């Protein structure tokens, strides 16, 4: 319905914050450590496998901090989450935790051993979203996924072909990629790559030219900002009440929720704060394969590529010692709030060209697709590759918001006429 | 030669002035109530209506505005105009608000319907300039026009048709047509399509074409700075005798007078002022398919695209209650000026590039458009339209000017690197 | 090794030195006319025209000053030239004269006269580096040419053949074919785009060179224009300079010397060149002229070149000297000598690249709904004549936005170890780079 999806969410949310708070109560944790990011990840690293447990719980004894391990009843668990909500069964608020998980592993790690081993493009990066949602992720977990994460899963069972329920799963999984796609071409063709009765190279070697499509022709994928758990909560605690006042994964709600929130993290000597800040803030709002330049813009100061960065990851490996460790301020803020897309191009009853009123140094805008865009796949595609180029512009009439505006409502659009600062975080 | 053009067009211009004064005079209307474009309009429209009537004329009460509906004799009207030009006819002078009208529709409307029921696309908003502009309109009246005005007449002409002296209309409407465009084959194209005594389908599908070919290689539209009749007679009232002090509507004759202009309108209830204004400053100057980035800059103020505009119309509708009716003061005046131009814009000494003899740091320079610049008359502008950038810059060398700078003397460069808020008004 | 080349380049610069000294020692020169730049050409041309003599010698009546059309005995000078030189024949030394000349020439006269001639764009000027420099030059000789001077040469052959004398036929024509060839990998060798490169190599192939072939290079002449050759910029000076410098007793041979260090800096730094300018001329703009054929900076940005010197490097078209050689059909009495400004503030290290375009990203997804354009590695993605319509690609991609040699900047005349980069922040609307 209308209302009545924010409705929904928020109370997933309520549920979440409210249980994370619980575990809080009974671990027995003071303000500070329960807004550890370190700590909330494992809380919710529970939670998942008590429906599918232990972890590491780092407090800080007198002095300095200490990493403990617990162990727990995966039915225990199981059930104080179905009191937080409210005792029916929220797969939603698990989902949304896996979401979260992932896009701060699709920001932390770059996974190309798998692509390798797959026969793709090490540099696809950019179509390899949520590759690492489980199994069990929702139906909204398709969503957020991409076309690499989809091409490879759908390559992987060939080789397990190759070398019933599996038909099945087969042309579904399938379909999946073929609605991400926008393109007639890119769409057509994934009809003929299901077709077929077997998974030949005549599929592989097709599927992996729709990744490469992908990348100029890009699909739809859902971006959804899932913040830890601490943050709700945090929010559950303070007394917000989400379900009667409603909350959205894609609106300005998780931007100005954040910019009240205040998430700790372990710190090891010799990394930035700075750059462990921007990390967890790519993961949440899954801007990781997102324009460097304008995530920059939004966050109000300079997102350093993966490179240039200053941290070897987000949770503390067992080896590591608790000598050698600090705490830091994360800073998950931003000058300004945006909305998040499901979609990657478009291709209106708008205006195409601007008609000149006054002699002036003017680049005259005109949007080149759209105009000009007025039994073969292969070829056809390659016809609307060539016609093409990065300098075009999408999203027309979108922008920034201030957080201050509630409502997008008076937009900022950005207009880089700068340096190449790095458009490419990996 | 700053004498008959300078000196004539002032002429024309002290005409509508005393005309408005005398008009105001009869009405027995105030001096705020003669400032207020709602009764200068439905004054014009008295006037153009009676040389080819009533009308709306709102009163100022204590406190609330009074609407009055009144009726003229039709030949008085056009007795106290002549009265106003020497007994002359000033066809000149009709024609003037024949235009103010126009650029004020252009800007406050959205032509869509007549476009698609023409078979024209309805994004092709930039090229209807002077849609609204009576046929009656002089032959520099028709000038202001844009190339997609022109087309949906001829379409029409021929659609009716196709479904005597009829005839040197079509072949002009189309030399008119062909004079819009600068360029070799969009010239030749328009003779092509000239040549059919009974042009049908067979045209209709080619002009199209060539109405497309506009949103990339523009053609010459004059734009004409028409200013309310309440600003001129008000200005005539005030000393100012422009036929002896020259004045201009390409200048920046149009933009000093606006910059001491008093003139107020009705407001509704909910709408916003700085958004009134903005609507009538960008009928002033036929700033309505401009780049809203420029339109912005020169005005002073952001200059915000008609979606996020609150307002409905600038003419009060007989629907409408007083009751809950206010006014405010327009705000008019602009940041600097620039030459209202004609030109569309189009895309050999010296070096090109550059060649690094130093090992430092730096950008290699290079003129990039220049450079990359390396049967059907279609092909031929098709392939025009190809090696055309957005980024290609137009009108090189010009700039804008302070309101102090009377003269043409020193011109300035703007740098769009900048927080911007769009490019099409619509 | 290293310490090696310094120690030829000394040996090489020493007997350069020792020579213009034996030819000064020789007219009974001072050292002020062994100073004035014009009689330095003179004497380097004579020491040419002696390995393939006469010029315009100048002496300075008190009020005025003097010509004098020396003709010395040919056999004589190169006599003289292994005397100074150990009894090497310094070949290399010889080759440095004519560089020097080549650098000072691009720096004053815009090439067109020939462009046009055989077909080239009027535009590349860029491209047309080393061109006056004759065939008789070695590999220096080359590296120093760019992609125009190529491509001008290799047009001029293939025209040549339409002419058709049998031009690449029997066994002479077999014999220029090979050179054709030469000419061919030298032009292709200059590339760094492997497209440029076997574009080359498909126009070499050709047997009966014609308008296709021709409009081929025309275009990898363009491409050159944005994807920059990699050519050869180096340091040569006017013996006259060289006299100077061994005077005090340098031996480069030891010190060492470079080309492309700051050891051709160091010279210029503390060195007395007279120039004779004629009237209505600024007397500084004959400076930067000499000062830019020193260091081959005619095709420089103007912005790095008008910061690597302390002054602002004004480009052709207002820089008013035609010339640092005087015509014999004008005036003589009217010529002011004045000292040339051959000096800076900093000094930079010569390079060859033209900065030209792991396992990393190459497009990007949205994530934000915002007006902005969509990157994408174009080159890369849509890798699947080819060469013609793959180089666009590259061009399409180049920006001029695009900094090249990241992490080189200009070292102090202090920094005699090039150690303390100066990365220089350049755009402050002073742009106009282009000298022509």
């Given at each position: 319905n209308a209302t009545e999806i924010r409705a929904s969410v928020g109370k997933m949310i309520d549920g979440i914050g409210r249980f994370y708070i619980q575990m809080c109560t009974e671990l027995k944790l003071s303000d500070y450590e329960g807004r550890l990011i370190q700590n909330s990840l494992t809380i919710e690293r529970m939670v998942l496998s008590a429906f599918d447990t232990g972890g590491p719980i780092y407090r800080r004894v007198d002095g300095k901090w200490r990493r403990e391990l617990i162990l727990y009843d995966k039915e225990e668990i199981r059930r104080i989450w179905r009191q937080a909500n409210?005792?029916?069964?929220?797969t939603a608020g698990l989902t949304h935790m896996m979401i979260w998980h992932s896009n701060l592993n699709d920001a932390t790690y770059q996974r190309t051993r798998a692509l390798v081993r797959t026969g793709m493009?090490?540099?696809?990066?950019?179509?390899?979203?949520?590759?690492?949602?489980?199994?069990?992720?929702?139906?909204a977990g398709a969503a957020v996924k991409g076309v690499g994460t989809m091409v490879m899963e759908l390559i992987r069972m060939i080789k397990r072909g190759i070398n019933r329920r599996t038909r099945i799963a087969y042309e579904r999984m399938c379909n999946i990629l073929k609605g991400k796609f926008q393109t007639a071409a890119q769409r057509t063709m994934v009809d003929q790559v299901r077709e077929s009765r077997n998974p030949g190279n005549a599929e592989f070697e097709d599927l992996i030219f729709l990744a490469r499509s992908a990348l100029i022709l890009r699909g739809s994928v859902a971006h959804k900002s899932c913040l830890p758990a601490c943050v709700y909560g945090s929010a559950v605690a303070s007394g917000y009440d989400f379900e009667r006042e409603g909350y959205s994964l894609v609106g300005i709600d998780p931007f100005r929720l954040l910019q009240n929130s205040q998430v700790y993290s372990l710190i090891r000597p010799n990394e930035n704060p700075a750059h462990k800040s921007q990390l967890v803030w790519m993961a949440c709002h899954s801007?990781?394969?997102?324009?460097l330049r304008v995530s920059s813009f939004i966050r109000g100061t300079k997102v350093v590529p993966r490179g240039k960065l200053s941290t070897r990851g987000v949770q503390i490996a067992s080896?590591?010692?608790?000598?050698?460790m600090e705490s830091s301020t994360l800073e998950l803020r931003s000058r300004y709030w945006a909305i998040r897309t499901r979609s990657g191009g478009n291709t209106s009853s708008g205006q195409i060209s601007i008609q000149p009123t006054f002699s002036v140094q003017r680049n005259l805008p005109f949007d080149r697709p759209t105009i000009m865009a007025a039994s073969d796949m292969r070829t056809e595609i390659i016809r609307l590759m060539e016609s093409a180029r990065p300098e075009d512009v999408s999203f027309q009439g979108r922008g920034v918001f201030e957080l201050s505006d509630e409502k997008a409502t008076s937009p900022i659009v950005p207009s880089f006429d700068m340096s190449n600062e790095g458009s490419y975080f990996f």
């Open positions: 409210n005792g029916d069964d929220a493009d090490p540099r696809m990066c950019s179509l390899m979203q949520g590759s690492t949602l489980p199994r069990r992720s929702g139906a801007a990781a394969f997102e324009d080896n590591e010692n608790m000598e050698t």
